[PDB]
Point group: D4
Chain length 205, copies 8
């Protein structure tokens, strides 16, 4: 499987003149103010991925950020709440056109409580995601082949999952519900950055 590794940014957008792009991130942890963005992964859905190493202190990634800003391109995430927060914190741009397979799973796979990407890929695609490298030093100057393959696996299948989840949202008549959740998701990520990451803002208490 072809995985193109880059330093800093995509060299150009020639592989991303598309309606929808799969996006994922790797970091030194779950706390965007402490744990820096280390990797950004992209896939056009053609079975290949781009794995972009983000340097410490890196302030710009113009080609990546152009995609994230392009309202004509849907950014597909799994649990985009996290990715949106670290991407916006790092480069100062919050995408506003998104699809999230974890929210989609919670709205459609009502017959299970397991909504992780590994579980979804196994059930919907018979694809095995290995999570061995999930907790690894993503800030390493040189990523191992296993790290690169894990990072790519998080974006290689999101188009196919989105297709299936769109079928399920239509079947159960929840398209407008999913759309409103996706519309709010960038602000949910902003709330996390602003200090409400532990607070369900809609809860009674």
């Amino acid at each position: 499987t072809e995985i193109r590794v880059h330093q800093g940014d995509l060299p150009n957008l020639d592989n991303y003149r598309i309606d929808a792009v799969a996006v994922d991130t790797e970091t030194l942890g779950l706390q965007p103010h402490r744990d820096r963005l280390c990797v950004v992964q992209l896939s056009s859905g053609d079975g290949t991925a781009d794995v972009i190493q983000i340097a410490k202190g890196q302030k710009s990634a113009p080609n990546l950020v152009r995609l994230l800003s392009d309202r004509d391109i849907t950014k597909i995430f799994h649990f985009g709440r996290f990715d949106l927060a670290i991407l916006a914190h790092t480069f100062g741009v919050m995408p506003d056109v998104v699809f999230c397979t974890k929210i989609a799973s919670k709205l459609t796979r009502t017959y299970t409580d397991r909504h992780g990407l590994k579980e979804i890929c196994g059930e919907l695609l018979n694809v095995n995601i290995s999570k061995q490298q999930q907790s690894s030093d993503w800030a390493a100057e040189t990523l191992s082949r296993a790290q690169i393959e894990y990072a790519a696996s998080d974006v290689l299948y999101l188009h196919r999952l989105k297709d299936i989840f769109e079928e399920r949202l239509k079947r159960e008549e929840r398209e407008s519900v999913a759309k409103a959740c996706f519309q709010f998701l960038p602000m949910r990520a902003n709330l996390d950055l602003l200090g409400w990451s532990e607070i369900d803002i809609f809860a009674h208490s």
Copy 2:
């Protein structure tokens, strides 16, 4: 001054305004089991309308016209609940809302008490009495204590909204609040559809 009505407002003469305070009373917290019993409205002029909703009542045209009017902001405290029961009962989901509980959670960061009683006490030195919160709101005739509790829940929302808007401006959270209000009707729909116990945005 509290105007008590059966079924619906007699007319909209008191609600040619920019924003209306809205609250509801029910037989409990479960909209599929616990019917809407009372709808309270206030213009902010210190008067309230308390509308008794009958069992099985399917319509209330004057109330619903207000709820439908995109030029009128519906102010709630914890509108998540009121939006659900109103939409479930009359079939219309308001889409222009302000919620003082979300606003409190976004501004009163110096406390963990965001109930309406606590907010009214701190911001207005107004005393809300919760004694009738748990009462038979389906009664044919509401007690004087019930009518006054129901009215107290809308009499102050305009004044609270003004203060919270100052706080949202001061701490630069106006667009955060606006996106939360924009999603609140769909959050209420999610509750009606079966996700009332689920934070749809949580990782697990």
Copy 3:
């Protein structure tokens, strides 16, 4: 408030030629195999009560038991699950025509989670129940006046509560639901005596 105190049993049922009788018990504790029946309270709903002291090791109370066995007389309890268990354990007869105000409250007072008799009496009747004597030596040879008044207070209002709860069950169309619950309640008390007192027999786990 007339409260007639008896040793062992009523002398006759002349005050109980009625369609429903309010019943409550006091004991040495919540565990019927360890904590003996000490007091049985009755009221016809006329604002008077009978308080019957049960002796240690007492095996029969024929007038009381005739009432408990009479299928033409509904026995009204608050939380009859407990009273039914201790009554059947002590005298060998399980009443099978019952009404429970706590079950009725849970089926109708859906706007609260407080279903205690004190709470219900306050809300429905504006009647104040003092629970100071609830935890006291109910096995004492002579009950104090405060004990006797607490014991009587537990039965003096059950008819009035049943009337209101019957109105609410009709209004919310739950009469057949309530009837089924009352029909099962004696066997729920039996399940407690047999060893399932800590088990919700209908739960998935």
Copy 4:
């Protein structure tokens, strides 16, 4: 080897169900009957075969199935019938009133364990292995997978044999009348769930 007959909508007729007791199970889109539709109803006569009935979205009628559900001369055997009774009554409007539940029976007889699931019971009582891999699957799919069909059938193929053993244990420990009263209330317990008390033990002190 196990004959599994798959149907769309309803049984074609009741020729296989002129019997005193029928094993019943359901598959759905989830645990919430107001949100999660009935997708499959499974039946067995106890002869080692099973009928697996796909229920369409929006389907309001299943006349032959519902005939059995309403026939008071036929005991409907479930495992954890509390759930099945709720979604069946919610979908077709008929609550069965003559039932036997192997989970309740297990709680009243297998006092030497805390594991009352169907897989555990089949393993202990029959040395039969139940595989739960398809329990969480898309039961609304237009075509069920072979694995799905076999899971669905496995939930009804053994209930008669389990009922027989549990009746033996209920007699031995003298709990027949207790079990009977539990089964008599179970339909109303399922109704309480539909009406809004699914999270409430109605008999609890608090």
Copy 5:
């Protein structure tokens, strides 16, 4: 291993003219008032065991009970708290000279929190206890071979465990503490039968 299976009682005490006997029980569950005694197991420590089926409603087992009341014979249990209760409840004799390997483990195996018999046998003896039949129908008229072997495995090793725990109690100077725990253990079992099974009688709350 030789496992002698008996109905009702030992035929005689020819194998039990010894200073200490290993004892275990099987039942229909953990609640002695509901769940009858089904099996009593004994071993003299010679690698053989006796497995005694107790009939429903059986009131007498004179040879077994002679041993239980013989103050010259220490009764060894693993978690005797349970066995003492069901034995005393069934036959009316509470042993008063006992040793418990679970209490002993809690007083000596301070380097672990796993005090079950299976864990103890693996560590101290490299003996594998299979727990598959622990939850089984112990009231069956004919016990399976696997049930018989499980029941015997619970007594075949208690002498060997006791010898080791005695060495450890001496080594850490806790012999008098263990002795006082064993002296109280029959009353702890009695407390369970009387209604305090869920109460640590010595706790502050």
Copy 6:
């Protein structure tokens, strides 16, 4: 209310030629290895009390310890588990003839879950214990009158409570149960000093 305050020890035993002495302690906290014994309180039951301030580092108290050692004098405590541990840890003598009103309450006041001394004195004697000074500096050179009264209140009523609990133990036929619990209590206190203060040594886990 006559309360005699002493430094170090009783001046003599003239007020303690009796069959039972009420005993309580005050400390710098709940951990006997960290928090030193500060006060020992005694009462003969005559409505007076002795309050003995114990100095930091004090290793003996001959008159007090004579009483603690005297097999012919029952030491009455409320929750003696604590007092026994700190007394034995400080002066090296573990009393072995004891009565504990908290254990007695748990064996008799089965109609409540409130077994503190304040609640017991309220119910059984209509005596009000004020707990304001329970958390105070018991190591202070000069105790306040409020502290002295709190300390004395803990021993002034134990004789009267013991009398009532002995009546209840006899009534419910639990005398031998209580006696066995009191007999183990000194070893329960030793178990705490040795490192099992957080462990119910009789629990299955």
Copy 7:
């Protein structure tokens, strides 16, 4: 006597002393979100200085001089919080500190209540009112009750420190407390860096 100042002390004339009592008020418990609003100081003479901190204020030279002065002990109650917000706001972490809450946890072993209100009541028979703890500390004008609460938090720390020092000596824990106070600034830094929810010394 309570002196209210804008931005900073006018001078250090009242603080030519060995130890100063310090407290802070904020918009909440999260230093990256909730700005510093008030800094309170007392010399121990029964008077207090209440300093209102402006939104976006970056410097307070006289206050920061005190905070940086290695010759002056800064006395806090639960300084873990005050150290974090003061350092995050003005860039200077005090490194000579005494904390009465740590002191209380090391000496008041006979209770589990270590709040400032409980300590003042027990040790001084002084009643601290908490009514204004949760209030809008960012208000342009502080109420008298707010000012008195702020001042009450520093007016007694000298007297409490004196008592706690006697207890630390009596129970022979002086070097334990010193080591705790020595690490406290770094514990506050760990909070600012993202470990505020983590006991860094715990096994798990």
Copy 8:
């Protein structure tokens, strides 16, 4: 190579070094009840010394020389435990330490698994077997499995310390870690004195 000794190292010939890896085995987690049974050392050269400590042993002169030598850093994994039992047993608290568990918590922010086994697996692809962790460490003769487990706990600490030092430098947390290591002996002392269940820095 694993060298097993009774009582003490025979000499310090193998420990004329800048840092020594140290671990302990005991009869349990409570130092006042559960005696020190084994002390393990390694110089980092791939060999280890395993010292059986006798019941009631008060002296280990060569070992204790290392522990009090301020020119030698003592490397631990979760030294909070080892420091407590060593100081309780021999009366000397080391004052120059490095802890791989604290270092992991400060650097391996991408996981919540900070045990030695997980650390060795990720950082070194070294498999630590925990089978003997709960065993009778007071046995007169340790099994080979026990000896290998005990040695494994020190054979890799130098290599881990080097990697953690790289991570601390990369993320600029060196002074944070130093302060944590400085307080760690006092944290172990707090455990011995009776605060083992208390986070002394917590609000409650």
